[PDB]
Design a protein around this ligand. Structure first.
Ligand SMILES: *[C@@H]1O[C@H](CO)[C@@H](O[C@@H]2O[C@H](CO)[C@@H](O[C@@H]3O[C@H](CO[C@H]4O[C@H](CO)[C@@H](O)[C@H](O[C@H]5O[C@H](CO)[C@@H](O)[C@H](O)[C@@H]5O[C@H]5O[C@H](CO)[C@@H](O)[C@H](O)[C@@H]5O)[C@@H]4O)[C@@H](O)[C@H](O[C@H]4O[C@H](CO)[C@@H](O)[C@H](O)[C@@H]4O[C@H]4O[C@H](CO)[C@@H](O)[C@H](O)[C@@H]4O)[C@@H]3O)[C@H](O)[C@H]2NC(C)=O)[C@H](O)[C@H]1NC(C)=O
Ligand code: Y3W
Ligand code: CA
Ligand code: NA
Ligand code: NA
Ligand code: ZN
Length: 806
């Protein structure tokens, strides 16, 4: 109930929330069906439209009018945004040359540059170039301020997950808004775009920027707008708030536009109908900047122009139907469209089986346009598993397509030409970022980055301490003239042991054999020097990784590679090696096919054993430093040490062997050498974070050898590829992956073919940031370079996407 009989007089667009049942006068009262009886009359005036005309200049004030052109309007803060242009001879902001804003130029009483976030739904990144001719205000922001060529949304590339990620810095699995539609099995409640459940605060996790600001005494404008409030009124309300007395005035403001998404769904991303929505958004930017100019705030405010996601061409005819795969289609509930999520229709049905559903959906039709995954097997870069609202079965749908349960859902539940939601590396899903104002840089292009990083920067712009989030604070310092956040590298928690030769061969009873016993003064000294680290500068290029948790581990040096060997997990945490452009690939010699060698620096008790692999009929092993890339026949023996061995399913060894034997040398040829760091990952609870020893669900049969969920590699070279990776003077270039360690290659429909036709495709799908590997391993990389720390933070957030040019 709401007592709608109260009044909005003197309260229009009031900032504090009045609790039930008193009626409301704020931005969102319409959405809550709670506005006072007189809200439209007093607060949504429309008389005489939105623009001054020559004949209104100097007019006697009529409070009925939507905005004013009377001589008192500037003191009242309610002029039409074009007032000074029409009545006072001024220029539109867009017509002024851009001039660097070196310092804020703010009116007296302003404690900090205000932040205005101007958000656009469905604004695909390529609109900034493709629509530039019809968006002069936006083009001026972009060209004169700081801009990225695009900004990467979060998965799923839907509106509410992305808007809330912008506001919180968190992945959807952490903030809880994992889709526009959700079922939470603990609440037994459904969240939808339609209806009241979505208003319950229990859905909304983390801490959004307006709450961060408020808790730290920085006032925020009301954070969002009821859809029926016209854009012109939203801009006028923001400008009105900016004229409040100092003690009452917000420091952070948000505008949101439902366009171009609304038309893009109807017309497709480049429908000819799309020009007009782009012009109308540009005109709204122009109203804002003109309004700011009138208030003398156009060289004071920081403006962020940012979108939530792009828009792809999708039509009704490109729909896959689960009814063409499943016999039991009425026993499941599907959340449909550009992603699929499947769960049992009834919790009382004991004949629901997820394995049979996945199997029936796997590589069943030649051009099949979706792929099923259990959620833990989704690419780790999606960070889309650790929430009870994310169903165990997920369908990744190809761009341009939909999935639905049955055909009747598509015509009795056609018209649309655009949609979004797909994998957040897809080019059509990328969106926009421009920052303009005194705290942003001038005429500066920055590389693409992810929208999870912006919350920290918005906090930086407001002088706020961010709530804990998934950005990497400092990684976006290059967007900023001032207010940078200067992080310190985390402290190493565990220091390594450096074992020498401590064990004789016969102390080992590992069940391993090797044909290595065929036989000096200076030659033996030389190999003693390798074991003490004499080649470590060549193979450990950026320092050893720091271990940021408590554990017991050994550094092991070799001619061709260096490792940090865990005494607890019985394998390396990391193995580091450099491969020059000139390196040569060799075979594993016949007499060494099954060679595994005890490591006389590591006790039998802290070693793997070969008998466990013999007896585990599902599990084989591989090596982290590749035997194929040994520098000499003699150095090759080091690659068969038991301290370089890791458990690998035979299906995964197909993938791993091709990467090691073919791809590493390809990357070294293309990049002028590469440095590789490889290792295992254990994430059995799919939380994106390193497992402790007691979270491990699978061991090599009969042993304490834990089985990795994933294997990673970080592949670094010189950004200026005229310098070899091992003699690089400047910025670095990286690409990395986190490959699922699976017992089959059912993900790869073409896996019966030669690895050359499918392995690299698999690897590209599981591309990763160095930071993702950091979270999964408790390691900290790039500790010793000549590069600034914020630059290394940006390198660690880089994702190699393999999409062609935007
Ligand atoms: C991205 O960044 C985010 C933010 O930094 C990272 O998420 C953090 O990671 C931590 C580890 O996973 C996690 O820490 C836990 O917090 C528990 C208290 O949680 C509440 O309080 C906080 C603070 O206000 C709040 O933010 C939380 O919000 C979560 O839960 C609510 C529901 O109440 C949701 O609305 C909200 O969206 C969010 O859910 C998300 O996180 C939870 C986990 O908290 C997931 O389950 C969800 O799926 C979703 O992802 C909460 O309101 C605290 O109790 C935990 O402590 C346990 O474990 C530690 C281990 O150190 C142990 O010491 C304790 O004994 C304790 O164990 C006991 O509980 C166990 C579980 O029941 C039990 O088995 C034991 O036997 C014990 O009884 C723990 O500290 C932190 O909450 C989240 N924060 C957020 C916002 O998500 C994220 O990791 C980053 N991602 C990556 C990849 O880097
Ligand atoms: C301060 C501030 C900051 C940010 C980032 C926004 C945006 C633009 C992104 C929108 C957030 O809306 C959400 O989160 C929903 C709850 C509506 C899904 C805002 O309104 C206000
Ligand atoms: Ca984990
Ligand atoms: Na085996
Ligand atoms: Na396959
Ligand atoms: Zn949309």
């Amino acid at each position: 109930w709401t007592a709608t009989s109260g009044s909005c007089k003197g309260r229009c667009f009031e900032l504090q929330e009045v609790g039930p049942p008193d009626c409301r006068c704020d931005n969102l009262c319409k959405s809550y069906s709670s506005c006072c009886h007189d809200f439209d009359e007093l607060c949504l005036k429309t008389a005489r439209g939105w623009e001054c005309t020559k004949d209104r200049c100097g007019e006697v004030r009529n409070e009925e009018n939507a905005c004013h052109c009377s001589e008192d309007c500037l003191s009242r803060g309610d002029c039409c945004t074009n007032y000074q242009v029409v009545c006072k001879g001024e220029s539109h902001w867009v017509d002024d040359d851009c001039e660097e804003i070196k310092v804020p130029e703010c009116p007296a009483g302003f404690v900090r540059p205000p932040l205005i976030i101007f958000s656009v739904d469905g604004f695909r990144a390529s609109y900034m170039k493709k629509g530039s001719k019809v968006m002069p205000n936006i083009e001026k922001l972009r060209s004169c301020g700081t801009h990225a060529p695009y900004m990467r949304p979060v998965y799923p590339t839907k509106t509410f997950p992305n808007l809330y990620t912008l506001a919180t810095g968190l992945y959807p699995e952490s903030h809880g808004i994992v889709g526009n539609s959700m079922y939470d099995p603990v609440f037994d409640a459904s969240f939808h775009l339609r209806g009241r459940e979505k208003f319950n605060h229990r859905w909304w996790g983390g801490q959004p920027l307006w709450i961060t600001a408020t808790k730290q005494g920085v006032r925020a404008g009301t954070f969002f707008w009821s859809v029926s409030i016209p854009h012109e009124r939203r801009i006028l309300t923001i400008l009105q708030w900016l004229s409040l007395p100092d003690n009452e005035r917000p420091s952070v403001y948000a505008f949101y536009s439902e366009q171009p998404d609304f038309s893009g769904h109807k017309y497709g991303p480049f429908g000819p109908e799309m020009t007009n929505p782009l012009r109308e958004i540009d005109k709204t930017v122009g109203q804002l900047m003109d309004g700011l100019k009138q208030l003398r705030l156009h060289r004071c405010v920081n403006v962020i122009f940012v979108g939530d996601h792009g828009m792809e061409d999708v039509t009704c005819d490109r729909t896959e139907f689960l009814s063409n795969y499943l016999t039991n289609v009425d026993d499941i509930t599907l959340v449909p469209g550009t992603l699929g999520r499947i769960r049992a229709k009834s919790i009382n049905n004991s004949k629901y089986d997820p394995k049979t559903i996945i199997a029936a959906l796997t590589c069943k039709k030649p051009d099949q346009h979706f792929k099923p995954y259990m959620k833990q097997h989704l690419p780790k870069r999606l960070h889309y598993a650790n929430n009870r609202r994310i169903e165990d079965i997920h369908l990744l749908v190809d761009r341009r397509w939909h999935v639905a349960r049955k055909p009747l859902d598509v015509y009795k539940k056609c018209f649309f030409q655009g949609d979004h939601g797909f994998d957040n590396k897809v080019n059509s899903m990328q969106t926009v970022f421009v920052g303009y104002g005194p705290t942003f840089k001038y005429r500066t292009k920055v590389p693409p980055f992810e929208n999870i990083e912006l919350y920290n920067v918005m906090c930086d712009l407001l002088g706020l301490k961010p709530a804990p989030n998934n950005g990497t604070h400092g990684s976006l310092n290059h967007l900023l003239r001032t207010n940078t956040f200067r992080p310190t590298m985390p402290d190493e928690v565990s220091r390594p042991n450096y074992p020498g030769i401590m064990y004789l061969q016969s102390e080992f009873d590992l069940g391993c054999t090797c044909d290595d016993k065929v036989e000096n003064k200076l030659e033996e000294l030389n190999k003693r020097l390798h074991t003490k680290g004499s080649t470590k500068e060549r193979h450990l290029l950026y320092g050893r990784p720091a271990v940021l948790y408590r554990t017991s581990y050994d550094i092991l040096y070799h001619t061709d590679f260096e490792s940090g060997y865990s005494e607890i997990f019985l394998m390396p945490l990391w193995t580091s090696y450099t491969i020059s452009k000139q390196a040569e690939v060799s075979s594993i010699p016949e007499h060494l096919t099954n060679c595994v060698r005890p490591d006389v620096r590591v006790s039998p008790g802290f070693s793997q054993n070969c008998l466990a692999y013999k007896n585990d009929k599902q599990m084989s092993y591989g090596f982290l430093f590749p035997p194929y890339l040994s520098s000499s026949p003699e150095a090759k023996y080091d690659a068969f040490l038991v301290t370089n061995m890791v458990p690998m399913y035979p299906a995964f060894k197909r993938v791993w062997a091709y990467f090691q034997r073919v791809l590493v040398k390809k990357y070294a040829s293309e990049r002028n050498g590469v440095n590789v760091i490889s290792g295992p990952i254990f994430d059995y609870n799919y939380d994106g974070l390193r497992d402790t020893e007691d979270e491990i669900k699978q061991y090599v049969e009969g042993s304490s050898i834990p089985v990795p969920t994933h294997y990673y590699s970080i592949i670094t070279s010189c950004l200026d590829f005229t310098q070899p990776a091992d003699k690089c003077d400047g910025p670095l270039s990286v690409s990395s992956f986190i490959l699922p360690h699976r017992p089959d290659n059912d993900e790869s429909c073409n896996s019966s073919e030669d690895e050359s036709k499918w392995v690299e495709e698999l690897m590209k799908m599981h591309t990763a940031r160095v930071r993702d590997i950091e979270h999964l391993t408790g390691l900290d990389f790039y500790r010793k370079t000549s590069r600034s720390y914020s630059e290394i933070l940006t390198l660690k957030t880089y994702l190699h996407t393999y999409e062609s040019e935007i």
